[PDB]
């Protein structure tokens, strides 16, 4: 009995509705997996696949009440969760899945085995996914204008290519990249090109994810990054002028983890999967509230140094020290990019870069030598080291150099340490930094009298 129960069982036997570990209901319609808590996806699937059931079952599914009964039966039948979005080298489209390691495009049940629950939102066109075209030469000219193929720009260009290509691989990336440069240098053009290329896998959020508390309450600004392969933030302010909050290192470290806590309004799903490449456009370098060794492992910088100016302001730009090259501005390029002219050309370029930079494992490495905020830590980290045991047979040398021994621990006088620091970094130049380092790296032998359990590398080098 229960024709409706039989219909629900038949639909469940097709493996077209699945329950995820988070609590979602993903359905397979029109050659793609979709989930949406606001749309009647299960009844949509029932109506869509009414054609694959017997003729006596097809006519029963034209009634919304009966479709809702079938949906209730299916919901009670789904008891086990599944693992979704586990292939980091598959790019999902609206009509199939592209193999990023092989170049094969799968449609239908071939693409169904990879439970890719997101998509670009548009259809793959193999007649445009071609190497040579009128659009490809123009796109290559644009890219070579933005990032010149010169010898002094080799490393920066390769880093730019790697960062752009990493927006295809759906895994957790462990760095935050900063597109730094002066005005009119191509950063927004690059952003728009990437958005056109990867479609719905691209999202843009606010600086609140960098300068606010992520726990909070309902946070759609974080909940909108679930499974996105690229996240953009833009327009960092100048932190030198007091009045702007600094970037939270806690947020920076929390954004590189495989899961991020944040939930929408009227929703109970708090944890989102992190597959994102986070890129920040800025005219100014970042300043963080607190600097430590971990934070320095998650920051990378790509610099833009080509100006596109109108003919009136070309001469003033040619004498600027923030530009290496000046080019003529193009006034139709924005519209051409907006109309998705270079979508498949840039997609092909990104796939080629993915192949080139995906030597067995692809990983993003930090560039801490570019951020001025990290210079004080980087310099002093190679000059002073903790107490020494194998250098214990040098206590006479330490005493002659000014150090003292206390429980076989090297201690330096505060005044002597200040005088030594003044040589490498002037007091007038970095008094706040030197005083903070003295107060932070030193232990308190008393309320007033204290000592630093850190000796200079050069002092120990002296025999």
Residue ranges binding ligand ATP (CB under 6 A): 142, 145-146, 181, 183-189, 281, 283, 294, 308, 327, 329-330, 333-334
Which of 89, 136, 218, 404 touches a second copy by CB under 8 A?
218
d(CA 246, CA 210): 9
Q: Is 205 in the site for a second copy (CB under 8 A)?
A: yes
Site membership for Mg ion, residue 283 (CB under 5 A): no
For DNA, the closer CB: 218 or 402: 218
Should residue 271 be labelled a site residue for DNA when binding is judged by CB under 7 A?
no
Nearest to residue 186, comparing CAs of 320, 378, 6, 337?
A: 337
Q: Which is nearer to ligand ATP, 145 or 450 (CB)?
A: 145
Minimal distance, residue 217 CB to DNA, in Å: 6
Question: Which residues lie closer than 8 Å to 70 by C-beta, 6 or more apart?
Answer: 4, 7, 8, 11, 46, 61
Q: Which residues, at least 6 apart from 178, have a Cβ–Cβ distance to it below 8 Å?
A: 279, 280, 282, 285, 286, 299, 300, 301, 302
Between 142 and 295, name the residue whose CB sits nearer to Mg ion.
142
Which partner from the list Mg ion, ligand ATP, DNA, none does 330 bind, CB cut-off 5 to 8 Å by kind? ligand ATP
List CB contacts of 232: < 8 A, sequence separation 6 or more: 191, 202, 203, 204, 205, 278, 279, 280, 281
Q: Which residues face 348 on adjacent strands?
A: none
Closer to a second copy by CB, 260 or 348: give it. Answer: 260
For residue 267, state whether it binds DNA (rule: CB under 7 A): yes
The smaller minimum CB distance to a second copy, of residues 131 and 448, is found at 448
Calpha distance 313→317 (Å, rounded): 6
Determine, following the binding rule CB under 8 A, whether residue 84 of this chain makes contact with a second copy.
no
Q: What is the Cα–Cα distance from 252 to 293, expressed in whole angstroms?
A: 13
- Least Å distance, CB 131 to a second copy, is 29
- Which of 87-95, 207-215, 262-270, 386-394 is the region at the interface with DNA (rule: CB under 7 A)? 262-270
- Which residues face 443 on adjacent strands? 451
- Pair of tokens at residue 70: 């079938």
Give me 421's structure tokens.
């620091």
Kindly state the smallest distance separating residue 2's Cβ from a second copy, in Å: 4
Q: Which of 55, 266, 311, 448 binds DNA (CB under 7 A)?
A: 266
Given candidates 188, 283, 418, 422, which one binds Mg ion under the rule CB under 5 A? 188
332 binds DNA (CB under 7 A): no
Give the separation between CA 307 and CA 330, rounded to whole angstroms.
12
| Region of residue 94 (left: phi > 0; alpha: psi -120 to 50; beta: else) | alpha
43: partner contacted, choices Mg ion, ligand ATP, a second copy, none (Cβ within 5-8 A by kind): a second copy
Residue 185 interacts, among ligand ATP, a second copy, DNA, none and using kind-specific CB cut-offs from 5 to 8 Å, with: ligand ATP
Q: Tell which positions 202-241 bind DNA, by CB under 7 A.
A: 217-218
Q: What share of the chain is helix, strand, coil (3-state, %, to 5)?
A: 40, 15, 40
Q: Using CB under 7 A as the criterion, which residues of the chain lie in contact with DNA when the complex forms?
A: 217-218, 263, 265-267
Q: Using CB under 5 A as the criterion, which residues of the chain lie in contact with Mg ion when the complex forms?
A: 188
């Amino acid at each position: 009995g229960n024709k409706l129960f039989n219909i629900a069982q038949r639909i469940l036997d097709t493996n077209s509705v699945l329950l995820t570990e988070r609590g979602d209901h993903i359905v397979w319609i029109n050659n793609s997996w979709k989930f949406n808590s606001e749309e009647p996806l299960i009844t949509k699937l029932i109506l869509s696949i009414r054609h694959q059931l017997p003729k006596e079952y097809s006519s029963e599914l034209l009634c919304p009440r009966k479709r809702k009964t079938v949906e209730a039966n299916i919901r009670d039948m789904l008891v086990d969760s599944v693992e979704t979005d586990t292939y980091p080298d598959k790019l999902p489209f609206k009509n199939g899945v592209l193999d990023l390691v092989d170049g094969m495009f799968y449609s239908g049940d071939d693409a169904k085995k990879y439970t890719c629950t997101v998509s670009t939102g548009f259809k793959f066109d193999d007649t445009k996914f071609v190497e040579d075209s009128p659009e490809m030469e123009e796109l290559m000219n644009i890219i070579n204008d933005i990032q010149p193929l010169t010898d002094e720009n080799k490393k920066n260009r390769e880093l730019y290519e790697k960062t752009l290509s990493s927006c295809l691989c759906g895994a957790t990336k462990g760095c935050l990249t900063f597109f730094f440069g002066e005005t009119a240098t191509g950063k927004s053009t690059t952003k728009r090109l990437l958005k056109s290329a990867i479609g719905d896998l691209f999202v843009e959020t606010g600086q609140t994810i960098l300068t606010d508390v992520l726990d909070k309450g309902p946070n759609p600004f974080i909940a909108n990054m679930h499974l996105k392969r690229s996240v953009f933030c833009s327009e960092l302010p100048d932190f030198a002028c007091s009045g702007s909050k600094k970037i939270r290192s806690d947020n920076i470290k929390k954004l590189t983890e495989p899961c991020v806590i944040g939930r929408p309004c009227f929703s109970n799903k708090i944890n989102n999967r992190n597959h994102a490449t986070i890129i920040i456009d800025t005219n100014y370098k970042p300043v963080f509230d607190r600097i430590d060794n971990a934070l320095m492992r998650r920051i990378a910088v790509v610099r833009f140094r080509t100006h596109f100016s109108q003919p009136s302001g070309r001469e003033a730009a040619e004498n600027n020290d923030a530009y290496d090259k000046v080019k003529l501005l193009d006034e139709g390029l924005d519209g051409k990019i907006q109309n998705n002219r270079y979508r498949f050309a840039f997609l092909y370029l990104l796939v080629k870069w993915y192949k080139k930079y995906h030597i067995p494992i692809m990983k993003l490495y930090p560039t801490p030598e570019e951020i001025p905020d990290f210079a004080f830590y980087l310099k002093i980290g190679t000059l002073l080291v903790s107490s020494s045991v194998k250098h214990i047979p040098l206590m006479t040398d330490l005493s002659k150099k000014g150090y003292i021994l206390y429980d076989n621990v090297v201690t330096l006088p505060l005044t002597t340490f200040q005088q030594k620091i003044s040589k490498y970094f002037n007091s007038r130049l970095f008094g706040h930094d030197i005083e903070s380092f003295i107060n932070r790296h030193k232990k308190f032998a008393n309320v007033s009298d204290e000592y630093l359990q850190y000796i200079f590398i050069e002092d120990i080098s002296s025999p």
